């Protein structure tokens, strides 16, 4: 691990505070602008859709990435939620109601066992099994997110290789000739402090850069800064052009 | 199957000639600017890296997408070829020497049986074991490419699902919030007519558009037209913005 306080300039310029954590897989070396916040555990919010997907797929709650989960007919306040989804689009649009149904079908017993198997955060599912990642007891730090994502990247989580490959496909966010980003956003609003998450990794030709960022998110107006600030760090470090 | 000759304007504007074939998976509907050329069989060239990858993986010639195939030290005309590669980068940069090694390991007997099992093109491997897809007897039409790609997309090829998932991952070319393109370029230069290929599919939120295009390619200078003309068709059909 190494601290680079120059990345704070990317938070200060947008009048925000947070942490970006990078992990160079080839060098087995990590970097961050705030090592203490890098190890501070927060609610994972919708970044929990990564382990949730893995568990649901491995248990057969989700058959594959094509299975359609019908809209339940309740009109909610994000338009993308009021439609049918598969695993790919439910993750892409952070469709909480779809994943709440996953968690209910997983059940608390299997959810707790799998999170312990995953070594995921504090492994605590206090609260409702269908909302504990938004207002329950689960807590995870950016470094714990990287450690979890690293296992997922190497297919070393205690689930089938197939489940891990499907979830890594579902995490696909952006890709061109220069890089591939597999990642998941998070927005924790039910319990203070309100924060935004972005966790994942950048695949290059000859290396992988794991990243986990969170930042204070008092309003929804700064949600785009999760990707913007992370990308500025990635560009400064010559990871992406 | 419906013919739309208005797409010829995209070929004519670049003083080019070729065919684009689209398959709407949801509607089970096919479209092309030239029905006859859509069913004319050409050398697959480097689009054969899709079945070649699947066979190498299923036979254990390639263990996974991380296995490094070290540069043999011979400096070739393509700069990106003169380095170590894995399955991902070898597909991305169409590293023929890496796949010629795969084909030599597969051998004629297993290659022929697998292509027969794949129902791939004319299923004929006549010629050299490590170059038949560039100057041998194998031929495939644009519609036969789509028929093959649909099987791959649905994990219905005879090989393991894992092999098909690894290859679909390697086919990743481009992705954003609007669409995902999994595809493979090809350039057939050894036997006339010299043609460029681009085959794959466009993943949308609620549909998948399979595509297979080829076009006359007298020099490498116009290889960018493969993606450019295809995207103009995709834009015209309101598939990508
Ligand atoms: O009920 C909750 O707690 C909750 C509600 C909405 C979101 C959400 C919806 C769409 C995008 C995003 C984003 O992070 O961009 C977040 C997250 C959580
Ligand atoms: O020896 C042959 O026949 C051969 C040689 C090179 C290529 C090639 C190299 C890089 C990109 C592309 C492309 O299609 O963009 C093609 C293909 C075939
Ligand atoms: Cl992918
Ligand atoms: Na991956
Ligand atoms: Na090619």
XYZ file of C-alpha atoms and ligand atoms in Angstrom:
521
model
C 0.000 0.000 0.000
C 1.041 3.589 -0.732
C -0.659 6.934 -0.123
C -0.826 9.499 -2.942
C -2.419 12.684 -1.582
C -2.222 14.338 -5.021
C -5.459 12.544 -5.947
C -7.236 14.764 -3.411
C -7.055 17.504 -6.055
C -9.688 15.577 -8.038
C -12.017 15.642 -5.035
C -11.250 19.254 -4.074
C -11.894 20.511 -7.614
C -15.496 19.217 -7.423
C -16.018 20.373 -3.799
C -16.277 16.758 -2.650
C -14.554 14.360 -0.262
C -13.875 10.666 -0.658
C -11.319 7.955 -1.314
C -10.088 6.181 -4.435
C -8.257 2.873 -3.989
C -6.256 1.288 -6.805
C -4.645 -2.154 -6.864
C -1.972 -3.008 -9.434
C -2.395 -6.757 -9.910
C 0.898 -7.334 -11.735
C 2.896 -5.352 -9.172
C 0.816 -6.616 -6.219
C 0.834 -3.009 -5.019
C -1.981 -0.728 -3.906
C -2.461 3.034 -3.970
C -4.949 5.410 -2.377
C -5.399 9.071 -1.473
C -6.609 8.288 2.075
C -5.526 4.992 3.637
C -7.771 5.476 6.680
C -10.921 6.070 4.641
C -9.745 3.273 2.330
C -10.228 0.931 5.306
C -13.414 2.574 6.607
C -16.386 0.217 6.326
C -19.636 1.582 4.875
C -22.921 0.126 3.752
C -22.152 -1.393 0.320
C -25.447 -0.103 -1.116
C -25.994 -1.416 -4.651
C -22.401 -2.658 -4.896
C -23.877 -5.599 -2.997
C -25.527 -6.577 -6.282
C -22.228 -8.276 -7.128
C -22.287 -10.840 -4.258
C -26.098 -10.935 -4.429
C -25.890 -11.935 -8.106
C -23.252 -14.575 -7.356
C -25.347 -16.158 -4.609
C -28.581 -16.013 -6.621
C -26.917 -17.640 -9.637
C -25.113 -20.327 -7.644
C -28.318 -21.235 -5.783
C -30.413 -21.274 -8.963
C -32.561 -18.346 -7.826
C -31.379 -16.853 -11.128
C -31.073 -19.404 -13.930
C -28.832 -17.264 -16.160
C -28.258 -13.717 -17.388
C -31.151 -14.043 -19.874
C -33.942 -14.932 -17.428
C -36.519 -12.142 -17.412
C -37.836 -10.875 -14.084
C -41.128 -9.127 -14.758
C -41.842 -5.684 -13.373
C -44.127 -6.108 -10.367
C -46.412 -3.338 -11.646
C -45.542 -0.914 -8.841
C -44.559 2.398 -10.433
C -41.411 3.574 -8.656
C -39.560 6.876 -8.922
C -36.748 5.756 -11.264
C -38.193 5.131 -14.723
C -35.697 2.402 -15.647
C -37.036 0.296 -12.756
C -40.605 0.153 -14.112
C -39.937 -2.497 -16.753
C -38.869 -6.095 -17.179
C -35.222 -6.828 -16.440
C -32.662 -9.584 -16.678
C -29.581 -9.910 -14.489
C -27.582 -7.712 -16.884
C -30.016 -4.797 -16.957
C -31.054 -5.097 -13.301
C -27.414 -4.661 -12.311
C -26.860 -1.928 -14.912
C -29.776 0.185 -13.658
C -29.333 -0.861 -9.994
C -32.879 -2.208 -9.930
C -33.228 -2.696 -6.168
C -36.695 -4.379 -6.321
C -35.393 -7.172 -8.556
C -32.472 -7.870 -6.227
C -34.735 -7.617 -3.180
C -36.686 -10.530 -4.656
C -33.396 -12.387 -5.175
C -32.441 -11.886 -1.528
C -35.854 -12.988 -0.248
C -35.579 -16.204 -2.265
C -31.975 -16.713 -1.142
C -33.148 -16.395 2.455
C -31.232 -15.218 5.500
C -29.672 -18.609 6.275
C -28.019 -19.042 2.881
C -27.250 -15.322 2.550
C -25.363 -15.357 5.844
C -23.473 -18.564 5.008
C -22.429 -17.284 1.571
C -21.189 -13.915 2.837
C -19.079 -15.737 5.415
C -17.773 -17.960 2.618
C -17.060 -14.840 0.530
C -15.195 -13.168 3.429
C -17.383 -10.203 2.453
C -17.016 -7.169 4.713
C -18.208 -7.690 8.263
C -20.358 -10.594 6.944
C -23.335 -9.260 8.915
C -26.856 -9.354 7.480
C -28.677 -7.729 10.411
C -32.012 -6.276 9.392
C -34.194 -7.428 6.540
C -32.656 -9.995 4.208
C -34.064 -7.935 1.318
C -32.612 -4.570 2.378
C -29.695 -5.155 4.751
C -27.220 -3.801 2.195
C -29.163 -0.511 2.182
C -30.226 -0.092 5.822
C -28.991 -3.177 7.719
C -25.789 -4.179 9.449
C -23.508 -5.117 6.550
C -20.385 -2.964 6.306
C -17.487 -3.135 3.863
C -14.436 -0.982 3.187
C -12.874 -0.059 -0.136
C -9.920 -2.373 0.532
C -12.335 -5.175 1.419
C -14.141 -4.444 -1.850
C -10.851 -4.851 -3.727
C -10.036 -8.071 -1.875
C -13.491 -9.415 -2.754
C -13.252 -8.296 -6.393
C -9.772 -9.825 -6.702
C -11.168 -13.207 -5.653
C -14.011 -12.785 -8.155
C -11.573 -11.896 -10.939
C -9.566 -15.070 -10.268
C -12.680 -17.289 -9.879
C -11.582 -18.043 -6.308
C -14.830 -17.153 -4.545
C -16.644 -20.121 -3.011
C -19.165 -20.403 -5.846
C -19.127 -22.047 -9.267
C -16.814 -20.684 -11.938
C -19.930 -20.251 -14.090
C -21.602 -17.959 -11.541
C -18.458 -15.826 -11.319
C -18.126 -15.576 -15.109
C -21.778 -14.538 -15.471
C -21.447 -11.855 -12.792
C -18.224 -10.521 -14.310
C -20.059 -10.307 -17.631
C -22.935 -8.469 -15.919
C -20.466 -6.007 -14.360
C -19.363 -4.857 -17.831
C -19.692 -1.082 -17.856
C -17.421 0.289 -20.577
C -15.036 -1.132 -23.157
C -13.008 0.070 -26.127
C -9.662 -0.732 -27.723
C -7.812 0.786 -24.750
C -9.480 -0.772 -21.702
C -12.382 -2.740 -20.269
C -14.166 -1.586 -17.109
C -16.188 -4.079 -15.080
C -17.729 -2.215 -12.183
C -20.764 -1.522 -10.022
C -22.063 1.789 -8.697
C -23.533 2.253 -5.248
C -25.659 4.948 -3.634
C -26.246 4.660 0.124
C -28.964 7.077 1.257
C -30.985 5.326 3.971
C -28.330 5.583 6.707
C -25.825 8.378 7.214
C -23.344 9.186 5.907
C -24.830 9.386 2.411
C -22.146 8.118 0.030
C -21.647 7.034 -3.557
C -19.676 3.906 -4.462
C -17.900 2.755 -7.590
C -16.024 -0.548 -7.357
C -14.565 -2.772 -10.043
C -11.471 -3.121 -12.157
C -9.877 -1.913 -15.384
C -8.640 -4.687 -17.672
C -5.674 -3.679 -19.824
C -3.801 -5.758 -22.393
C -1.142 -6.895 -19.902
C -2.497 -5.869 -16.487
C -5.599 -5.420 -14.352
C -6.202 -2.390 -12.131
C -8.719 -3.061 -9.376
C -10.426 0.009 -7.988
C -12.816 0.848 -5.186
C -13.982 4.390 -4.535
C -16.525 5.990 -2.272
C -17.299 9.648 -1.698
C -19.691 11.759 0.333
C -22.957 12.143 -1.596
C -25.224 14.606 0.240
C -27.295 15.164 -2.925
C -28.002 13.010 -5.964
C -26.591 15.802 -8.155
C -23.006 14.592 -7.677
C -23.575 10.944 -8.621
C -21.681 11.333 -11.903
C -18.577 12.285 -9.919
C -18.171 8.644 -8.871
C -17.028 7.726 -12.378
C -15.606 11.159 -13.229
C -13.262 11.395 -10.233
C -12.207 7.747 -10.553
C -11.428 8.264 -14.234
C -9.370 11.383 -13.499
C -7.286 9.295 -11.091
C -6.999 6.540 -13.709
C -5.849 9.077 -16.316
C -3.317 10.690 -13.984
C -1.881 7.236 -13.284
C -1.712 6.546 -17.065
C -4.086 3.581 -16.706
C -6.566 4.918 -19.279
C -5.834 7.673 -21.838
C -35.530 -12.344 -44.458
C -35.990 -8.851 -45.919
C -33.743 -6.959 -48.337
C -33.008 -3.262 -47.720
C -30.872 -1.899 -50.561
C -30.801 1.592 -49.013
C -27.800 0.384 -46.984
C -25.842 0.344 -50.257
C -25.520 4.123 -49.868
C -23.157 3.463 -46.952
C -20.977 1.250 -49.150
C -21.222 3.557 -52.170
C -20.242 6.650 -50.164
C -16.878 5.006 -49.438
C -16.667 3.712 -53.033
C -16.918 0.257 -51.468
C -18.936 -2.893 -52.081
C -20.114 -5.506 -49.630
C -22.941 -6.950 -47.596
C -24.264 -6.345 -44.099
C -26.572 -8.976 -42.610
C -28.546 -8.226 -39.448
C -30.599 -10.667 -37.384
C -33.155 -9.341 -34.910
C -33.187 -12.073 -32.275
C -36.409 -10.946 -30.556
C -38.353 -10.637 -33.812
C -36.603 -13.627 -35.451
C -36.159 -11.370 -38.474
C -33.203 -10.977 -40.830
C -32.175 -7.992 -42.932
C -29.507 -7.417 -45.564
C -28.624 -5.103 -48.445
C -27.710 -8.018 -50.746
C -29.446 -11.362 -50.240
C -27.215 -13.176 -52.734
C -23.903 -12.009 -51.275
C -25.356 -12.701 -47.821
C -25.327 -16.403 -48.774
C -22.032 -16.390 -50.705
C -19.346 -18.339 -48.855
C -15.912 -16.744 -48.410
C -12.791 -17.703 -46.528
C -13.541 -16.791 -42.886
C -9.989 -15.485 -42.384
C -9.528 -14.252 -38.818
C -13.216 -14.579 -37.964
C -12.235 -18.243 -37.703
C -10.548 -17.256 -34.450
C -13.987 -17.617 -32.869
C -14.372 -21.382 -33.553
C -10.601 -21.880 -33.265
C -10.714 -20.384 -29.761
C -13.681 -22.577 -28.774
C -11.959 -25.757 -29.957
C -8.630 -24.893 -28.325
C -10.431 -24.225 -25.038
C -12.663 -27.302 -25.138
C -9.688 -29.543 -25.969
C -7.507 -28.029 -23.245
C -4.977 -26.604 -25.716
C -5.745 -23.285 -24.011
C -6.451 -23.622 -20.295
C -8.152 -20.234 -19.837
C -8.136 -16.629 -21.038
C -5.082 -15.875 -18.855
C -2.655 -18.444 -20.286
C 0.270 -16.571 -21.829
C 1.492 -17.587 -25.290
C 4.983 -16.152 -25.424
C 6.216 -14.353 -28.526
C 8.418 -16.677 -30.574
C 10.949 -13.864 -31.074
C 10.347 -13.455 -34.819
C 9.629 -9.791 -35.546
C 6.599 -9.710 -37.840
C 5.004 -6.885 -39.798
C 2.222 -6.264 -37.252
C 3.786 -4.516 -34.259
C 1.135 -5.779 -31.828
C 2.020 -9.361 -32.826
C 5.602 -9.059 -31.532
C 4.796 -9.587 -27.864
C 3.360 -12.128 -25.465
C -0.369 -12.707 -25.777
C -3.264 -14.398 -24.051
C -6.524 -15.478 -25.662
C -8.045 -12.020 -25.127
C -5.248 -10.009 -26.731
C -4.552 -12.638 -29.402
C -8.166 -12.368 -30.555
C -8.211 -8.565 -30.223
C -5.097 -8.078 -32.369
C -5.836 -11.075 -34.638
C -2.497 -12.646 -33.767
C -2.414 -15.295 -36.501
C 0.829 -16.961 -35.245
C -0.759 -17.711 -31.867
C -3.801 -19.309 -33.486
C -1.681 -21.228 -35.991
C -0.063 -22.864 -32.963
C -3.543 -23.709 -31.625
C -4.518 -25.254 -34.961
C -1.340 -27.340 -35.038
C -2.137 -28.631 -31.545
C -5.781 -29.345 -32.370
C -4.726 -31.303 -35.444
C -6.666 -32.050 -38.608
C -8.747 -34.904 -37.171
C -10.111 -33.013 -34.170
C -10.476 -29.752 -36.115
C -12.580 -31.454 -38.796
C -14.799 -33.255 -36.280
C -15.359 -30.055 -34.296
C -16.267 -27.994 -37.362
C -18.677 -30.744 -38.404
C -20.133 -30.654 -34.883
C -20.303 -26.847 -35.121
C -22.079 -27.047 -38.508
C -19.567 -24.320 -39.366
C -19.572 -23.155 -42.981
C -18.826 -25.914 -45.454
C -17.065 -27.803 -42.606
C -14.080 -28.394 -44.925
C -10.555 -28.052 -43.520
C -8.745 -28.947 -46.760
C -5.391 -27.227 -47.055
C -2.806 -26.600 -44.372
C -3.710 -27.466 -40.787
C -2.513 -24.047 -39.576
C -3.710 -21.872 -42.463
C -6.846 -23.439 -44.009
C -9.030 -20.572 -42.785
C -6.759 -18.129 -44.645
C -5.971 -20.009 -47.865
C -7.556 -23.490 -47.661
C -10.932 -24.957 -48.494
C -13.136 -23.663 -45.679
C -15.887 -21.262 -46.721
C -18.642 -19.552 -44.758
C -21.408 -17.143 -45.718
C -22.459 -14.083 -43.756
C -25.747 -15.815 -42.916
C -23.876 -18.975 -41.890
C -21.753 -16.793 -39.597
C -24.923 -15.503 -37.927
C -26.271 -19.034 -37.658
C -23.006 -20.023 -35.945
C -22.976 -16.912 -33.738
C -26.566 -17.488 -32.593
C -25.566 -20.944 -31.345
C -22.588 -19.427 -29.520
C -24.735 -16.683 -27.971
C -27.184 -19.305 -26.680
C -24.446 -21.712 -25.465
C -25.754 -24.349 -27.903
C -22.467 -25.186 -29.617
C -21.259 -28.710 -28.902
C -18.405 -27.462 -26.674
C -18.736 -26.712 -22.965
C -20.654 -23.660 -21.800
C -17.464 -22.447 -20.107
C -15.624 -22.510 -23.441
C -18.446 -20.527 -25.036
C -18.476 -17.980 -22.204
C -14.700 -17.487 -22.406
C -14.882 -16.905 -26.160
C -17.822 -14.515 -25.869
C -15.758 -12.622 -23.292
C -12.785 -12.532 -25.678
C -15.065 -11.244 -28.439
C -15.742 -8.097 -26.392
C -14.948 -5.180 -28.679
C -16.887 -2.146 -27.458
C -19.316 -1.311 -24.669
C -21.050 1.690 -23.130
C -24.368 2.514 -21.482
C -26.122 2.137 -24.858
C -24.875 -1.171 -26.274
C -22.326 -3.970 -26.102
C -20.554 -5.226 -29.224
C -19.013 -8.691 -29.211
C -17.419 -9.252 -32.591
C -14.392 -10.437 -34.538
C -12.740 -8.773 -37.513
C -11.293 -10.704 -40.420
C -9.160 -9.841 -43.429
C -8.943 -12.464 -46.179
C -5.980 -11.461 -48.362
C -4.479 -14.719 -49.623
C -7.197 -15.795 -52.084
C -9.295 -13.495 -54.246
C -11.546 -11.719 -53.761
C -9.789 -9.930 -50.898
C -12.488 -9.177 -48.334
C -12.744 -7.730 -44.851
C -15.087 -9.326 -42.317
C -16.840 -8.122 -39.208
C -19.136 -10.631 -37.502
C -20.700 -10.611 -34.058
C -23.678 -9.097 -32.331
C -24.924 -5.945 -30.628
C -26.326 -6.548 -27.148
C -29.106 -4.126 -26.242
C -31.022 -3.909 -22.968
C -33.909 -6.076 -24.214
C -32.729 -7.482 -27.557
C -29.672 -8.717 -29.417
C -28.859 -7.825 -33.023
C -26.554 -10.324 -34.696
C -24.510 -9.008 -37.594
C -22.179 -10.395 -40.228
C -20.643 -8.118 -42.837
C -18.022 -8.580 -45.497
C -16.787 -6.163 -48.125
C -14.239 -6.016 -50.910
C -10.907 -5.002 -49.375
C -8.173 -4.500 -51.986
C -5.786 -2.976 -49.413
C -5.496 -2.773 -45.638
C -6.048 1.000 -45.913
C -9.829 0.597 -45.790
C -10.092 -1.939 -42.970
C -11.658 0.705 -40.726
C -14.627 0.768 -43.105
C -15.730 -2.620 -41.737
C -16.762 -1.076 -38.419
C -17.639 2.315 -39.922
C -20.088 1.029 -42.541
C -21.598 -1.482 -40.103
C -22.229 1.278 -37.563
C -23.868 3.485 -40.197
C -26.258 0.597 -40.860
C -26.831 0.108 -37.125
C -27.506 3.838 -36.762
C -29.895 3.813 -39.729
C -31.853 0.924 -38.200
C -32.001 2.750 -34.825
C -29.991 -0.014 -33.129
C -27.257 2.266 -31.760
C -27.623 6.061 -31.285
O -33.871 2.669 -2.109
C -32.581 2.860 -2.127
O -31.873 2.775 -1.132
C -32.017 3.191 -3.464
C -32.807 3.782 -4.443
C -32.282 4.080 -5.687
C -30.952 3.799 -5.998
C -30.400 4.094 -7.343
C -31.201 4.015 -8.482
C -30.679 4.291 -9.735
C -29.350 4.652 -9.871
C -28.530 4.738 -8.753
C -27.098 5.118 -8.892
O -26.331 4.739 -7.906
O -26.687 5.733 -9.868
C -29.061 4.458 -7.496
C -30.166 3.213 -5.007
C -30.688 2.913 -3.762
O -1.427 -13.700 -43.054
C -2.670 -13.347 -43.221
O -3.405 -13.850 -44.059
C -3.140 -12.267 -42.311
C -2.240 -11.382 -41.728
C -2.685 -10.363 -40.905
C -4.043 -10.193 -40.635
C -4.520 -9.085 -39.769
C -3.680 -8.504 -38.819
C -4.126 -7.465 -38.020
C -5.416 -6.984 -38.159
C -6.273 -7.540 -39.101
C -7.647 -6.997 -39.278
O -8.481 -7.783 -39.904
O -7.951 -5.889 -38.859
C -5.821 -8.591 -39.896
C -4.935 -11.089 -41.219
C -4.494 -12.108 -42.043
Cl -17.765 -9.540 -21.091
Na -13.083 -10.614 -15.969
Na -8.835 -9.700 -38.479
